[PDB]
Design a protein around this ligand. Structure first.
Ligand code: LF2
Ligand code: LF2
Ligand code: ARS
Ligand code: ARS
Ligand code: ARS
Ligand code: ARS
Lengths: 144, 144
């Protein structure tokens, strides 16, 4: 399906804390970080992080105002990301499911989150690669 | 050259702050994070993060005592990482070079670091893919 450089970025709340969640839409691969609160500075920094790892062409979000900080515009600018003016899923419900199941295993919400991300990116499809294998396949295919 | 699941993990110091630096040895691709101080908890958490993203088989370090926390052993255990009992470069000098050059562009050391990581992972070889393209090629090739 989708162009290999599109990502979706959003925040959920759990335990009084904010989770920032990136989804590479063609694969389903997520990365995620617990931040103390939703600020433009946290978003910018996460985008900077994401961009030096993957080819990030455009990012979409379900709250466009997330992206209005100058901080955030500065990060998109410097790393050459364009915003998605062009899409009018839920992993957030599912990753939240996975978090709920491991929460036991860890003291800090952040550990549970990364544990949940690990499980998600590694599960093979109901029948069939894993999100982790898919993102890498898609992005390599788009190289060679 | 090297097995696609080997990583090197180490810390450098700059500005009174600790930088944790992961290097995928077959590609030269790095990821990096500024942490407030070198603790076993920071290392564990970074490994958890790294492992849900890439297939991480073994990790090496230039300071084996970094890896003796139970916290750290717990993270390697849960994510199935083995430590490298089997290697007797410098990117640290080079990434530090790249940091020194961009430091100007940012207030916080952390931003400069991610900016430096971005530049590193994206530069094409002197003649020739980039570290970013290489890691993805290696890891996809080892899938199919
Ligand atoms: C604070 C902590 N203390 C521990 C003490 C003993 C053991 Br065995 C594990 C942990 C883990 C622990 C839990 C799970 C895993 Cl996979 C690895 C370590 C944590 C976790 O925090 C990090 C990862 C930041 C150190 C946690 O939140 O529980
Ligand atoms: C605090 C800060 N304030 C700013 C104010 C105006 C503008 Br234009 C950029 C920044 C940037 C800034 C600098 C570089 C880039 Cl690439 C993007 C934003 C930062 C950076 O911090 C992060 C990334 C955490 C927000 C920084 O350390 O300078
Ligand atoms: As957000
Ligand atoms: As943007
Ligand atoms: As370290
Ligand atoms: As280990």
């Amino acid at each position: 399906d989708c162009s290999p450089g599109i990502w979706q970025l959003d925040c959920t709340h759990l335990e009084g804390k904010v989770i920032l969640v990136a989804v590479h839409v063609a694969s389903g691969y997520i990365e995620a970080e617990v931040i103390p609160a939703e600020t433009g500075q946290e978003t910018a920094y996460f985008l900077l992080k994401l961009a030096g790892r993957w080819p990030v062409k455009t990012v979409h979000t379900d709250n466009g105002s997330n992206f209005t900080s100058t901080t955030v515009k500065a990060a998109c600018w410097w790393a050459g990301i364009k915003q998605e003016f062009g899409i009018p899923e839920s992993m957030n419900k599912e990753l939240k499911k996975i978090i709920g199941q491991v929460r036991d295993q860890a003291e800090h919400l952040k550990t549970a989150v990364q544990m949940a991300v690990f499980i998600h990116n590694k599960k093979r499809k109901g029948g069939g690669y894993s999100a982790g294998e898919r993102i890498v396949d898609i992005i390599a295919t788009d190289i060679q």
